[PDB]
Amino acid sequence: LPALKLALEYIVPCMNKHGICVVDDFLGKETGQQIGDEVRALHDTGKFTDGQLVSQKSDSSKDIRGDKITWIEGKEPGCETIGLLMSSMDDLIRHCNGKLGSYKINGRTKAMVACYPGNGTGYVRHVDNPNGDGRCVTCIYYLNKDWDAKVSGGILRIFPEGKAQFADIEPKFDRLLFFWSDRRNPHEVQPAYATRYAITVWYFDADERARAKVKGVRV
Ligand SMILES: O=C(O)CNC(=O)c1nc(Cl)c2ccccc2c1O
Ligand SMILES: [Fe+2]
Protein backbone atom coordinates (compact mmCIF):
# COMPACT_ATOMS: atom_id res chain seq x y z
CA LEU A 1 0.00 0.00 0.00
CA PRO A 2 1.30 3.45 -0.97
CA ALA A 3 1.77 5.41 2.24
CA LEU A 4 -0.70 8.03 1.04
CA LYS A 5 -3.55 5.60 0.38
CA LEU A 6 -3.12 3.87 3.77
CA ALA A 7 -3.04 7.35 5.39
CA LEU A 8 -6.12 8.79 3.67
CA GLU A 9 -8.29 5.68 3.49
CA TYR A 10 -7.37 4.15 6.83
CA ILE A 11 -5.17 5.92 9.38
CA VAL A 12 -6.89 9.34 9.27
CA PRO A 13 -10.50 8.02 9.48
CA CYS A 14 -9.68 5.50 12.24
CA MET A 15 -7.62 7.99 14.27
CA ASN A 16 -10.35 10.62 14.09
CA LYS A 17 -13.11 8.12 14.95
CA HIS A 18 -11.36 5.85 17.50
CA GLY A 19 -8.10 7.54 18.52
CA ILE A 20 -6.38 4.22 17.87
CA CYS A 21 -5.41 2.56 14.57
CA VAL A 22 -3.82 -0.84 13.82
CA VAL A 23 -2.04 -1.53 10.52
CA ASP A 24 -1.03 -5.13 9.95
CA ASP A 25 1.75 -6.30 7.60
CA PHE A 26 3.22 -2.82 7.47
CA LEU A 27 6.65 -3.47 5.97
CA GLY A 28 6.28 -7.15 4.99
CA LYS A 29 8.19 -10.25 6.05
CA GLU A 30 11.69 -9.57 4.65
CA THR A 31 11.98 -6.04 6.07
CA GLY A 32 10.25 -6.99 9.34
CA GLN A 33 12.70 -9.87 9.81
CA GLN A 34 15.65 -7.57 9.04
CA ILE A 35 14.39 -5.19 11.73
CA GLY A 36 14.00 -8.13 14.09
CA ASP A 37 17.63 -9.09 13.39
CA GLU A 38 18.89 -5.55 14.02
CA VAL A 39 17.03 -5.31 17.34
CA ARG A 40 18.24 -8.74 18.45
CA ALA A 41 21.84 -7.78 17.57
CA LEU A 42 21.41 -4.64 19.71
CA HIS A 43 20.23 -6.89 22.56
CA ASP A 44 22.98 -9.50 22.09
CA THR A 45 25.68 -6.82 22.02
CA GLY A 46 24.71 -5.14 25.25
CA LYS A 47 23.12 -1.98 23.84
CA PHE A 48 19.91 -2.06 26.00
CA THR A 49 19.64 -0.87 29.57
CA ASP A 50 19.38 -3.55 32.30
CA GLY A 51 15.63 -2.86 32.66
CA GLN A 52 13.17 -0.83 34.73
CA LEU A 53 13.67 -1.53 38.44
CA VAL A 54 10.43 -3.33 39.29
CA SER A 55 11.11 -4.91 42.68
CA GLN A 56 13.80 -3.31 44.83
CA LYS A 57 14.75 -5.76 47.58
CA SER A 58 17.09 -4.69 50.40
CA ASP A 59 19.07 -7.56 49.01
CA SER A 60 19.89 -6.63 45.46
CA SER A 61 20.99 -9.66 43.42
CA LYS A 62 17.26 -10.38 43.77
CA ASP A 63 16.06 -7.04 42.40
CA ILE A 64 13.60 -7.67 39.60
CA ARG A 65 14.05 -5.61 36.39
CA GLY A 66 11.52 -5.32 33.53
CA ASP A 67 11.53 -3.44 30.21
CA LYS A 68 14.97 -2.61 28.79
CA ILE A 69 15.37 0.27 26.38
CA THR A 70 17.72 1.83 23.90
CA TRP A 71 17.27 5.06 21.93
CA ILE A 72 17.98 4.77 18.18
CA GLU A 73 18.41 7.71 15.77
CA GLY A 74 18.23 5.39 12.76
CA LYS A 75 21.59 6.12 11.10
CA GLU A 76 23.75 4.04 13.44
CA PRO A 77 25.70 1.11 12.03
CA GLY A 78 23.48 -1.99 12.13
CA CYS A 79 20.32 0.13 12.67
CA GLU A 80 19.59 1.22 9.15
CA THR A 81 16.49 -0.90 8.64
CA ILE A 82 15.25 0.65 11.90
CA GLY A 83 16.07 3.99 10.27
CA LEU A 84 14.04 2.80 7.31
CA LEU A 85 11.10 1.90 9.56
CA MET A 86 11.30 5.40 11.07
CA SER A 87 11.27 6.98 7.65
CA SER A 88 8.21 4.93 6.76
CA MET A 89 6.36 6.02 9.87
CA ASP A 90 7.36 9.62 9.07
CA ASP A 91 6.09 9.31 5.48
CA LEU A 92 2.74 8.02 6.82
CA ILE A 93 2.46 10.90 9.27
CA ARG A 94 3.51 13.45 6.61
CA HIS A 95 0.67 12.16 4.40
CA CYS A 96 -1.86 12.62 7.26
CA ASN A 97 -0.67 15.98 8.30
CA GLY A 98 -3.36 18.58 8.89
CA LYS A 99 -5.89 15.78 9.04
CA LEU A 100 -5.18 14.13 12.43
CA GLY A 101 -7.43 16.16 14.73
CA SER A 102 -6.42 19.80 14.32
CA TYR A 103 -2.78 19.02 15.06
CA LYS A 104 0.13 20.15 13.03
CA ILE A 105 2.90 17.59 13.45
CA ASN A 106 6.36 19.11 13.03
CA GLY A 107 8.80 16.75 14.68
CA ARG A 108 9.25 13.46 16.48
CA THR A 109 11.52 11.79 19.08
CA LYS A 110 14.23 9.27 18.33
CA ALA A 111 13.01 5.65 18.33
CA MET A 112 12.76 3.99 21.72
CA VAL A 113 13.33 0.29 21.25
CA ALA A 114 11.94 -1.70 24.21
CA CYS A 115 12.59 -5.29 25.16
CA TYR A 116 10.39 -6.95 27.77
CA PRO A 117 12.74 -9.79 28.72
CA GLY A 118 10.07 -12.50 29.30
CA ASN A 119 10.37 -12.75 33.12
CA GLY A 120 6.76 -11.93 33.92
CA THR A 121 7.18 -8.17 33.95
CA GLY A 122 5.00 -5.74 32.01
CA TYR A 123 4.31 -1.99 32.25
CA VAL A 124 1.85 -0.39 34.68
CA ARG A 125 -1.23 1.59 33.56
CA HIS A 126 -0.04 5.01 32.31
CA VAL A 127 -0.67 7.87 29.94
CA ASP A 128 2.32 8.56 27.65
CA ASN A 129 1.90 12.37 27.78
CA PRO A 130 -0.30 13.41 30.74
CA ASN A 131 1.21 16.88 31.25
CA GLY A 132 1.15 18.59 27.89
CA ASP A 133 4.73 17.95 26.77
CA GLY A 134 4.01 18.28 23.03
CA ARG A 135 3.59 14.61 22.10
CA CYS A 136 0.32 14.07 20.28
CA VAL A 137 0.61 10.64 18.55
CA THR A 138 2.28 7.46 19.78
CA CYS A 139 3.45 5.12 16.99
CA ILE A 140 4.53 1.55 17.94
CA TYR A 141 5.94 -1.17 15.65
CA TYR A 142 6.00 -4.77 16.87
CA LEU A 143 8.64 -7.32 16.01
CA ASN A 144 7.46 -10.56 17.45
CA LYS A 145 7.25 -13.51 15.04
CA ASP A 146 4.46 -16.00 15.80
CA TRP A 147 3.58 -14.24 19.06
CA ASP A 148 0.73 -16.01 20.88
CA ALA A 149 -0.55 -14.01 23.85
CA LYS A 150 -2.44 -16.94 25.28
CA VAL A 151 0.93 -18.55 25.90
CA SER A 152 3.33 -15.62 26.13
CA GLY A 153 1.24 -12.79 27.60
CA GLY A 154 2.42 -9.23 26.74
CA ILE A 155 -0.90 -7.87 25.47
CA LEU A 156 -1.13 -4.09 25.20
CA ARG A 157 -4.45 -3.15 26.79
CA ILE A 158 -5.73 0.38 26.00
CA PHE A 159 -8.71 2.07 27.66
CA PRO A 160 -10.09 4.67 25.21
CA GLU A 161 -11.29 7.70 27.23
CA GLY A 162 -14.58 7.17 29.01
CA LYS A 163 -15.35 3.75 27.68
CA ALA A 164 -16.59 0.56 29.19
CA GLN A 165 -13.89 -0.17 27.97
CA PHE A 166 -10.71 -1.82 26.81
CA ALA A 167 -8.97 -2.91 23.62
CA ASP A 168 -6.42 -5.79 23.76
CA ILE A 169 -3.74 -5.55 21.09
CA GLU A 170 -1.29 -8.39 20.52
CA PRO A 171 2.36 -7.33 19.93
CA LYS A 172 2.24 -9.11 16.52
CA PHE A 173 5.13 -9.25 13.99
CA ASP A 174 4.92 -6.37 11.46
CA ARG A 175 1.96 -4.65 13.21
CA LEU A 176 2.08 -0.84 13.36
CA LEU A 177 -0.11 0.94 15.91
CA PHE A 178 -1.00 4.64 16.34
CA PHE A 179 -2.84 6.20 19.24
CA TRP A 180 -3.31 9.68 20.77
CA SER A 181 -0.52 10.08 23.40
CA ASP A 182 -2.59 12.09 25.85
CA ARG A 183 -5.08 11.15 28.58
CA ARG A 184 -7.52 9.84 25.93
CA ASN A 185 -5.55 6.59 25.87
CA PRO A 186 -4.43 5.18 29.21
CA HIS A 187 -2.75 1.87 28.50
CA GLU A 188 -0.66 -0.92 29.97
CA VAL A 189 1.49 -3.93 29.04
CA GLN A 190 0.37 -7.20 30.61
CA PRO A 191 3.07 -9.50 31.96
CA ALA A 192 5.18 -10.95 29.19
CA TYR A 193 6.58 -14.53 29.49
CA ALA A 194 8.65 -14.46 26.33
CA THR A 195 11.05 -11.85 24.94
CA ARG A 196 8.90 -9.09 23.48
CA TYR A 197 10.32 -6.24 21.30
CA ALA A 198 8.66 -3.05 20.14
CA ILE A 199 9.87 0.23 18.64
CA THR A 200 8.10 3.49 19.57
CA VAL A 201 8.38 6.97 18.15
CA TRP A 202 6.24 9.89 19.39
CA TYR A 203 5.13 12.76 17.12
CA PHE A 204 4.96 16.37 18.35
CA ASP A 205 2.17 18.85 17.67
CA ALA A 206 3.78 22.21 16.86
CA ASP A 207 1.61 24.38 19.09
CA GLU A 208 1.68 22.07 22.11
CA ARG A 209 5.46 21.62 21.86
CA ALA A 210 6.09 25.36 21.42
CA ARG A 211 4.33 26.34 24.67
CA ALA A 212 5.71 23.31 26.54
CA LYS A 213 9.05 25.00 25.97
CA VAL A 214 7.69 27.95 28.00
CA LYS A 215 6.46 25.85 30.89
CA GLY A 216 20.36 27.48 29.08
CA VAL A 217 17.28 28.23 27.14
CA ARG A 218 18.85 31.36 28.57
CA VAL A 219 20.62 34.06 26.63
O1 LIG B 1 4.97 -1.92 24.20
C1 LIG B 1 3.73 -1.69 24.21
O2 LIG B 1 2.85 -2.36 23.63
C2 LIG B 1 3.23 -0.54 25.04
N1 LIG B 1 4.38 0.08 25.69
C3 LIG B 1 4.24 1.25 26.36
O3 LIG B 1 3.16 1.83 26.50
C4 LIG B 1 5.39 1.96 26.94
N2 LIG B 1 5.09 3.27 27.22
C5 LIG B 1 6.06 4.02 27.75
CL1 LIG B 1 5.66 5.72 28.10
C6 LIG B 1 7.35 3.54 28.01
C7 LIG B 1 8.29 4.42 28.57
C8 LIG B 1 9.58 3.92 28.80
C9 LIG B 1 9.90 2.60 28.53
C10 LIG B 1 8.95 1.75 27.97
C11 LIG B 1 7.66 2.22 27.71
C12 LIG B 1 6.64 1.42 27.14
O4 LIG B 1 6.79 0.11 26.79
FE1 LIG C 1 2.98 3.86 26.79
From Swiss-Prot:
In terms of one coarse class, where is the protein primarily found? cytoplasm
**List of residues that carry S-nitrosocysteine:** 14, 21, 115, 136, 139
- What is the regulation of this protein's activity? Following exposure to hypoxia, activated in HeLa cells but not in cardiovascular cells.
Question: What effect is documented for mutating residue 136 to A?
Answer: Little change in enzyme activity
Chain spans, region Beta(2)beta(3) 'finger-like' loop = 54-64
Q: Got a GO cellular component term for this one?
A: glutamatergic synapse
Effect recorded for residue 184 to H = In ECYT3; decreased interaction with HIF1A and EPAS1 and decreased enzyme activity
Look up the EC number in the record and give it: 1.14.11.29
What happens after mutating residue 139 to A? Slight increase in enzyme activity
Cofactor details (free text): Binds 1 Fe(2+) ion per subunit.
Report domain Fe2OG dioxygenase positions. Answer: 104-205
Q: How would you summarize where this protein is expressed among tissues?
A: According to PubMed:11056053, widely expressed with highest levels in skeletal muscle and heart, moderate levels in pancreas, brain (dopaminergic neurons of adult and fetal substantia nigra) and kidney, and lower levels in lung and liver. According to PubMed:12351678 widely expressed with highest levels in brain, kidney and adrenal gland. Expressed in cardiac myocytes, aortic endothelial cells and coronary artery smooth muscle. According to PubMed:12788921; expressed in adult and fetal heart, brain, liver, lung, skeletal muscle and kidney. Also expressed in placenta.
Q: Which cofactor does it need?
A: Fe(2+); L-ascorbate
Catalysed reaction(s) here are: L-prolyl-[hypoxia-inducible factor alpha subunit] + 2-oxoglutarate + O2 = trans-4-hydroxy-L-prolyl-[hypoxia-inducible factor alpha subunit] + succinate + CO2
Phenotype when changing residue 96 to A: Little change in enzyme activity
Record note on modification: S-nitrosylation inhibits the enzyme activity up to 60% under aerobic conditions. Chelation of Fe(2+) has no effect on the S-nitrosylation. It is uncertain whether nitrosylation occurs on Cys-136 or Cys-139.
Which terms are listed as keywords in the entry? Acetylation, Congenital erythrocytosis, Cytoplasm, Dioxygenase, Disease variant, Iron, Metal-binding, Nucleus, Oxidoreductase, Phosphoprotein, S-nitrosylation, Vitamin C, Zinc, Zinc-finger
What happens when you mutate residue 196 to A? Reduces enzyme activity by 95%
Signal peptide positions are none
Q: Which GO terms describe its biological process?
A: cardiac muscle tissue morphogenesis; cellular response to hypoxia; heart trabecula formation; intracellular iron ion homeostasis; intracellular oxygen homeostasis; labyrinthine layer development; negative regulation of hypoxia-inducible factor-1alpha signaling pathway; positive regulation of transcription by RNA polymerase II
What this chain does, per the entry, is described as:
Cellular oxygen sensor that catalyzes, under normoxic conditions, the post-translational formation of 4-hydroxyproline in hypoxia-inducible factor (HIF) alpha proteins. Hydroxylates a specific proline found in each of the oxygen-dependent degradation (ODD) domains (N-terminal, NODD, and C-terminal, CODD) of HIF1A. Also hydroxylates HIF2A. Has a preference for the CODD site for both HIF1A and HIF1B. Hydroxylated HIFs are then targeted for proteasomal degradation via the von Hippel-Lindau ubiquitination complex.
Subunit text: Monomer. Interacts with ING4; the interaction inhibits the hydroxylation of HIF alpha proteins. Interacts with PTGES3 (via PXLE motif); thereby recruiting EGLN1 to the HSP90 pathway to facilitate HIF alpha proteins hydroxylation. Interacts with LIMD1. Found in a complex composed of LIMD1, VHL, EGLN1/PHD2, ELOB and CUL2. Interacts with EPAS1. Interacts with CBFA2T3. Interacts with HIF1A.
The name of this protein is: Egl nine homolog 1
Q: Which organism is it from?
A: Homo sapiens (Human)
The primary gene name is: EGLN1
Included stretch of the parent chain: 188 to 412 of 426
